[PDB]
Amino acid sequence: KTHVQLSLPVLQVRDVLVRGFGDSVEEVLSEARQHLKDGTCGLVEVEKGVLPQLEQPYVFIKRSDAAPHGHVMVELVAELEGIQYGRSGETLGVLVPHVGEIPVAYRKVLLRK
C-alpha cells in the first residue's frame, strides 16, 4: 500500500528517552520510516522550546492533503541546521523512537509510504 493507517502515541518532550533517529538526514528518514512500519514511533507536538530539547536532524510529519476515516494524510520532511529535505503542509509534530513512554494522546494519520 502507498498509504498506511497509523495511530501514533503522542509523547511529552521531557519523557522522551531517545531524542532522534540518527545523525544524517537520510538516516533519520530511514529510521523514522522503519519505526513507523514496526509501531515503535512516537510524535512530539511542536511548541516553543520543544525542538531544542530534541536532536537534529529532525523528522516532521506534515499534512500532505485536506482525511480518510479521520486519519490525516501526512509525509516525512527532515530538517538539519534550518534546511528542510522535502516540501509539504503544516507540521503535525516531530517523530521520535518509542521505547514504552506513556502517551498523552494518539494522532490518527495516513502515512504516504
> End-to-end distance of the chain based on CA atoms, in angstroms?
8
Phi then psi for residue 4, to 5 deg, are -135, 120
The span from the CA of 86 to the CA of 78, in Å, is 7
Tell me the domain boundaries of the chain.
Answer: 3-112
Burial of residue 19 (number of CB atoms within 10 Å: 0-12, 13-18, 19+): middle
Closest CA to 58 of 35, 79, 43: 79
Annotated resolution, angstroms: 1.8
**How crowded is the C-beta side of 66, counted as CA atoms within 13 Å?**
2
Instruction: Give the other-Cβ count within 10 Å of 88's Cβ.
Output: 18
DSSP state of 76: E
Compute the Cα dihedral for 9, 92, 73, 84 and give only its sign: negative
Q: Which CATH architecture has domain 3-112?
A: Roll (2.30)
According to DSSP, the residues that pair with 106 across neighbouring strands are: 9
- What was the experiment behind these coordinates? X-ray
Whether the CB-CB separation of 51 and 68 falls below 8 Å is answered with no
Cell of 33: 520510516
